[PDB]
Amino acid sequence: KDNTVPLKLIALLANGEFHSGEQLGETLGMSRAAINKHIQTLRDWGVDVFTVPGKGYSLPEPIQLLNAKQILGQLDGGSVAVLPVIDSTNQYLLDRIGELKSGDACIAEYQQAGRGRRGRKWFSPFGANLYLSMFWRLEQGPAAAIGLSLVIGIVMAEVLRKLGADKVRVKWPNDLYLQDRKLAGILVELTGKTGDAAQIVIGAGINMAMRRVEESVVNQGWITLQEAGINLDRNTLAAMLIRELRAALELFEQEGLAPYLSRWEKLDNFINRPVKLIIGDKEIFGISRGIDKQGALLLEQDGIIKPWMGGEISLRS
Amino acid sequence: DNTVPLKLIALLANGEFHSGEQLGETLGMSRAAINKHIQTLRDWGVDVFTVPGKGYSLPEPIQLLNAKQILGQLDGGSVAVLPVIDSTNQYLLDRIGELKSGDACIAEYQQAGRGRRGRKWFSPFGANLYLSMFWRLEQGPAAAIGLSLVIGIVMAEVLRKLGADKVRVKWPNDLYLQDRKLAGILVELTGKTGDAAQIVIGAGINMAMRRVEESVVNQGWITLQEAGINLDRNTLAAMLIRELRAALELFEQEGLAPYLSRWEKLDNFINRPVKLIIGDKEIFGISRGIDKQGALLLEQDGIIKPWMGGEISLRSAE
Numbered sequence A: 001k002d003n004t005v006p007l008k009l010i011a012l013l014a015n016g017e018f019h020s021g022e023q024l025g026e027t028l029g030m031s032r033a034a035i036n037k038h039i040q041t042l043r044d045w046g047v048d049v050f051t052v053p054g055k056g057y058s059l060p061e062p063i064q065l066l067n068a069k070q071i072l073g074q075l076d077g078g079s080v081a082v083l084p085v086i087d088s089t090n091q092y093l094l095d096r097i098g099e100l101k102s103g104d105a106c107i108a109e110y111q112q113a114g115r116g117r118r119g120r121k122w123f124s125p126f127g128a129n130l131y132l133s134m135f136w137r138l139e140q141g142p143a144a145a146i147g148l149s150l151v152i153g154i155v156m157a158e159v160l161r162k163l164g165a166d167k168v169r170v171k172w173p174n175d176l177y178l179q180d181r182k183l184a185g186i187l188v189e190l191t192g193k194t195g196d197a198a199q200i201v202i203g204a205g206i207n208m209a210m211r212r213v214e215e216s217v218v219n220q221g222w223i224t225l226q227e228a229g230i231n232l233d234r235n236t237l238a239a240m241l242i243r244e245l246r247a248a249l250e251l252f253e254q255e256g257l258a259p260y261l262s263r264w265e266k267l268d269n270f271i272n273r274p275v276k277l278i279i280g281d282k283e284i285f286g287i288s289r290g291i292d293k294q295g296a297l298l299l300e301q302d303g304i305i306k307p308w309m310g311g312e313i314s315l316r317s
Numbered sequence B: 001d002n003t004v005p006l007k008l009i010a011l012l013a014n015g016e017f018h019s020g021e022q023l024g025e026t027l028g029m030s031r032a033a034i035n036k037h038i039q040t041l042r043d044w045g046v047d048v049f050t051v052p053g054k055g056y057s058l059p060e061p062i063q064l065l066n067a068k069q070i071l072g073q074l075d076g077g078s079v080a081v082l083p084v085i086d087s088t089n090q091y092l093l094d095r096i097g098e099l100k101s102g103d104a105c106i107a108e109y110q111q112a113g114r115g116r117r118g119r120k121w122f123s124p125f126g127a128n129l130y131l132s133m134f135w136r137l138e139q140g141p142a143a144a145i146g147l148s149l150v151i152g153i154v155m156a157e158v159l160r161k162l163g164a165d166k167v168r169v170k171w172p173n174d175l176y177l178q179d180r181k182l183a184g185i186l187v188e189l190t191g192k193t194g195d196a197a198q199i200v201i202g203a204g205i206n207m208a209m210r211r212v213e214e215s216v217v218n219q220g221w222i223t224l225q226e227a228g229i230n231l232d233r234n235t236l237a238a239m240l241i242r243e244l245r246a247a248l249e250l251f252e253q254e255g256l257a258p259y260l261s262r263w264e265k266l267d268n269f270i271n272r273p274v275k276l277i278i279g280d281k282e283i284f285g286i287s288r289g290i291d292k293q294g295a296l297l298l299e300q301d302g303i304i305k306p307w308m309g310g311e312i313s314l315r316s317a318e
């Protein structure tokens, strides 16, 4: 229920070097046994820590802790809150909706209640991945939310394809895949009034340096950038994402989906494959062929191609 | 706290004279104190005038809202009647977790009634209908604009059927009669793309209101009474609740299609010069109705484009 010690601890180990319990316990003022209890809390947070007789405690690889002012300096205005431990970055912005401005972001080292759609859970181990959320004020209201979801998918895919990710594709209308496994989850939440503006919170959970996953939280099948072959400074990659999304949406307000229609066709990881759609709880099946101009997924269930505006797509086993 | 001003208006609601005498006893207070609530009522928008020699009175009887009565004309679904509330929309939005599609609430008075872009909805006590209904859409945020069009269509159709012959709709929310606002409709929602959407529909229908606070209502306004239609609020609420429920069942299941042409015949601005405000941008053109997706079709210099968002309004000189 109290996080200061384990945080101070991860700050120490964060350099990838050995710290003996004797030294840690000295720096921190507690018994060696107590220093191990905190080491144990870090392990619960998803931090991987080992011990080596003589040397001490270590991280398999260094961690580059997020630095607000560091990411801020690579930006054009905008505000960025960097949080050690949060319930959900999305929740964090939703709660601050009235003081926010478009493109404001919030990013955390660790989520204790990271979430997805349909009440699902999003595995968020400390410091291994990017847990980033950005706020946006869509002047053209809720009707524009889906197209917005599509722009985000296309943009993040682009930023990562330019860094080594070849087979990184998008999922209609949220999430990134690669070699056919959730590489990143995107959760767009919103409050609006039809005929007025929509307040939007975009949440992205990008799998980067993660090594092991908890089978009963992630049954699905996952993948990481680290397994793609890339090691991005989270601080660097957050910069590039906020920069690009802020510009891509500024542009989508001005031109709609139009400039993104073709880009979606190349990136759809599901264009032309046996899929399945879920509406509430009533199952429905078929095949797919891109989207239309208003961003609706095009579903051919037996010869005829009808467009659906909602639901969750997925390959069928 | 106002347990009392309510006890007081329950007593005055029939429109009969009730002297400062009678009141004092069947209300346990000094006539000087009972005169303090009669002012709280004036502050809530009730026109209480006192005529020494006969007592206090209301210019016209008020048929207080009665949950039992309403509920008894419906089949299932909760209908919460709230004497005094801040906003019927806020009431439901605050209960999204326990509400089921079609649950509703009505109030006599709204202390913070609201419209779009941070505007106030003038809501004097017991003169108008202030109703909200909750709905859970599995299609998510995309379907919200369609939902708004259905509500306007259905509400208009009901009032026309009840006798106000020329009531029309404004894309995508609100009802008009003779180019003045008859009913304000405010649809709010929370949701996530790719999941459900929780929607709260708010209706502010002008009925018996005789005067307005000019600094809240500066545009034209009109009541059902001026349309010659004199309805009981409980009766209309039951009617509207039953009809919106059936229409949203139909929408949920078949979308906008079954409503498309019904729209074109009720549109108040079709083929007329309008202004579309988006954010801080006013753009001008001619309305041409809606497309199958519910987007407004705006013609600007011979070219027609679909607009999925924005606020519309009439343009005309004097």
Ligand SMILES: Nc1ncnc2c1ncn2[C@@H]1O[C@H](COP(=O)(O)OCCCCC[C@@H]2SC[C@@H]3NC(=O)N[C@@H]32)[C@@H](O)[C@H]1O
Residues within 6 Å of the ligand: A087, A088, A089, A090, A091, A111, A113, A114, A115, A116, A117, A118, A120, A121, A122, A123, A124, A130, A131, A132, A133, A175, A182, A183, A184, A185, A186, A187, A202, A203, A204, A205, A206, A207, A217, A218, A219, A220, A221, A222, A223
């Ligand atoms: N790390 C993971 N990698 C691969 N699969 C996983 C991972 N964690 C959980 N899963 C699996 O994803 C499934 C479905 O997620 P989704 O609801 O489609 O998901 C939509 C997107 C969720 C968004 C995450 C971001 S983090 C920043 C922001 N804050 C927040 O609470 N959510 C978003 C889960 O139930 C689980 O099987």
Ligand SMILES: Nc1ncnc2c1ncn2[C@@H]1O[C@H](COP(=O)(O)OCCCCC[C@@H]2SC[C@@H]3NC(=O)N[C@@H]32)[C@@H](O)[C@H]1O
Residues within 6 Å of the ligand: B086, B087, B088, B089, B090, B110, B112, B113, B114, B115, B116, B117, B119, B120, B121, B122, B123, B129, B130, B131, B132, B174, B181, B182, B183, B184, B185, B186, B201, B202, B203, B204, B205, B206, B216, B217, B218, B219, B220, B221, B222
């Ligand atoms: N009683 C009135 N009659 C005619 N004009 C008026 C009235 N009150 C205020 N106005 C004018 O309406 C304008 C704007 O309304 P709107 O945002 O288009 O409006 C969208 C719809 C408003 C929603 C009202 C309902 S009441 C039940 C529910 N609860 C709640 O808080 N809002 C909705 C106001 O700024 C004002 O000039």
